Design a protein around this ligand. Structure first.
Ligand SMILES: COc1cc(/C=C2\SC(=O)N=C2N)ccc1O
Length: 127
């Protein structure tokens, strides 16, 4: 059993910005989801070896998790807020694609997604 390498979190030739929307994504959005009681499965890449999910990376070809997002935000990896919002949405969608409705992990993702949507609704205008 093998896990793929994680998503990229460092790339010196990718242009980067530090913007008020990206600061909101770290200070408000990521921090709110990270502290939630259902955050733990999403705080690092899925370890398909330890979890005995040998088909996980056959089905999920664009993996994403909040550990990766946290690193991207803390290392100013992004150019704009849309790129980070897409990462969160990829994380939720992967969970719904791989699992069954009503599975514990899906209910956990849904609770985090509800908070995510609430916070993104008040994403500040770009200064
Ligand atoms: C079973 O599908 C998923 C599993 C996880 C992670 C888990 S599950 C567990 O017990 N520990 C973990 N770190 C994350 C997203 C998924 O879609």
């Amino acid at each position: 059993s093998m896990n793929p390498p994680p998503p990229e979190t460092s790339n010196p030739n990718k242009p980067k910005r530090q913007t008020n929307q990206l600061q909101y994504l770290l200070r408000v959005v990521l921090k709110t989801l990270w502290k939630h009681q259902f955050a733990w499965p999403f705080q690092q890449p899925v370890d398909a070896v330890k979890l005995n999910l040998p088909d996980y990376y056959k089905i999920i070809k664009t993996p994403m998790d909040m550990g990766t997002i946290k690193k991207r935000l803390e290392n100013n990896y992004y150019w704009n807020a849309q790129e980070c919002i897409q990462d969160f949405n990829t994380m939720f969608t992967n969970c719904y694609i791989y699992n069954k409705p009503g599975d514990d992990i899906v209910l956990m993702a849904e609770a985090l997604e509800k908070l995510f949507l609430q916070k993104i609704n008040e994403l500040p205008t770009e200064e």
